[PDB]
């Protein structure tokens with residue numbers, strides 16, 4: 152069931168912020184590789200002497216890329232006189248984050264009704280504060296609490312254009328790329344111990360465990376009331392023949408952090424075609440495809456959902472398919488987005504659970520561990 | 533004249549190394565924006581636990597992009613047991629460089645006859661050592677001395693494939709991009725004081741001042757014996773109405789460093805067409821074009837070198853033209869390559885000075901300061 156125990160009003164995923172060494176180059180790579188438009192900036196040209204921040208958008212999906220300038224540019228500033236557009240930014244925290252983790256997600260931001268209420272109630276309920284509520288131009292309130300590792304859960308709330316002090320990019324620089332991605336479906340964290348992580352986060356949010364349906368991990372999923380904010384969390388399982396990829400993550404990331412973002416497409420076939428066309432010319436690479444035996448086995452499992460043509464199209468693109476009690480899930484995983492084997496991206500599309508589509512329709516692919524192992528016995532063939 | 537006073541045998545520009553926060557994303561951006569192939573790697577997959585290094589090539593042009601992993605991966609190593617493929621790399625120096633300068637060039641590498649000789653003779657003649665000669669796999673010798681700021685001049689010499697411990701990229705990942713760029717023509721440094729910089733560098737190389745032919749800079753050019761290694765150096769001039777861009781550089785870079793790389797194309801028209809097509813989809817932007825009056829004035833200066841059609845093609849692409857006593861220079865400048873207004877790139881092609889083409893044929897564009905100022909009086913039109 153769903154007890155709907157959110158301790159404050161949570162709306163939707165609002166944006167994801169990457170902390171970078173150079174925001175320009177990461178943003179331009181992601182824009183081409185994923186098909187996202189440059190839509191806002193806050194940097195030297197907008198008066199920001201503290202950080203460079205570039206926003207990419209695709210549908211409702213908002214990726215923010217931020218890097219620090221030299222502290223010398225803003226050395227005479229103090230917090231009351233700051234030119235930073237994101238008041239929680241701090242040169243030392245950002246350099247320390249990036250040197251410790253490399254390229255990765257600093258903030259998972261959700262839109263709430265009242266960011267100040269959400270911050271107070273969260274801290275009242277165990278959340279470790281990270282940046283207190285700050286009202287920007289009497290219009291937007293932002294607050295941050297620790298999520299896991301050095302990742303913050305950022306609350307944003309609007310009285311009624313991204314953030315004050317961001318400018319819309321003059322569209323001579325804004326090329327209308329679009330490969331079909333429309334919103335963030337869920338965000339996945341890796342921790343050394345799942346239980347305490349769950350207890351902490353569920354402790355201060357009231358998010359409930361999302362109901363689900365021997366290789367490497369245990370996981371569980373936290374969800375908001377309407378189950379549109381979904382936050383899976385993994386822990387490693389040790390002693391296994393193949394080393395736990397969760398453990399590999401923790402080693403190369405220097406501890407807990409965000410493992411991957413799941414991006415919903417409105418047409419996963421066109422998204423993967425478009426992304427794969429660009430893999431070797433600046434975009435993203437994809438995990439190796441499952442063997443043909445995996446795809447033959449797809450008819451017996453989802454032959455009622457997908458035509459033979461649609462199945463054959465899943466095979467051309469390397470798409471995985473899983474199915475819940477309520478819907479069917481199409482998914483695929485990129486290779487790591489940067490130098491370290493840490494953060495990656497998953498492209499997904501859900502079919503079923505109409506009534507709008509309810510959140511998590513089809514689950515998260517748990518069934519594909521078994522299906523891929525058994526399929527990999529294609530050595531017989 | 534040219535006294536040919538090189539104190540050791542210098543061959544050609546060999547490569548440029550960028551020090552990055554994340555080498556993967558910078559390299560993939562540069563590859564698409566400039567049309568360079570992925571040709572070698574040294575990283576986790578090759579046994580390197582210290583740094584990630586990716587090599588892009590176009591003709592003879594070699595761009596190397598390097599970033600540090602977590603020190604924890606190599607904490608049990610010492611220099612005799614290192615897995616780094618570039619023995620001069622050091623986690624602390626790289627993080628300190630990047631935090632101080634942002635994305636930029638760490639090494640200007642030239643190939644010499646004997647890197648050990650070049651290092652000893654240079655230090656004997658005033659060069660500040662940076663990394664002593666090291667022989668890699670009994671095949672390649674590398675040595676580094678300080679050039680200016682935190683930029684090193686790196687010597688490389690081969691007994692007789694980039695460097696030992698680098699693998700050729702398996703070409704499923706190596707897409708044969710090519711927009712016409714073929715080699716590095718010259719590399720430009722900005723310093724606070726030109727005179728001491730010249731005296732130091734000419735002091736330990738024997739490079740001579742390259743003979744040339746009121747807004748912002750003084751500059752001078754150092755050259756090797758056959759004048760194929762060219763190293764211009766700028767200093768700011770203060771008190772000017774418009775602030776010195778050299779000074780702006782020094783402020784945002786936190787001191788002296790490499791200002792820009794000049795890349796020779798074999799077809800500057802195709803290069804700029806191809807680069808401009810990609811400016812807004814992950815590539816590089818170009819400085820704003822000169823006014824039409826600049827291009828009308830081109831007939832009277834280079835009408836004997838370029839047809840009206842070729843001139844009109846210069847106007848479509850924003851190409852600048854200057855002319856020496858010996859040849860004609862076509863040039864254009866990108867906007868900054870990363871977040872800070874520091875490093876950028878120039879695309880060039882030279883016509884004249886046949887006998888092969890002698891180095892610096894057409895100069896470096898000094899004449900375009902005056903031509904652009906006078907051309908900008910198009911307000912009358």
Ligand SMILES: O=C(O)Cc1ccccc1O
Nearest residue numbers: 339370383384515516517
């Ligand atoms: O970590 C993964 O590879 C995928 C994942 C993450 C979290 C919960 C369930 C799940 O299948």
Ligand SMILES: O=C(O)Cc1ccccc1O
Nearest residue numbers: 720751764765896897898
């Ligand atoms: O700095 C620049 O913009 C161009 C330059 C650099 C160095 C020498 C001569 C010259 O025209």
Ligand SMILES: [Co+2]
Nearest residue numbers: 339413497515
């Ligand atoms: Co998932």
Ligand SMILES: [Co+2]
Nearest residue numbers: 720794878896
């Ligand atoms: Co130049």
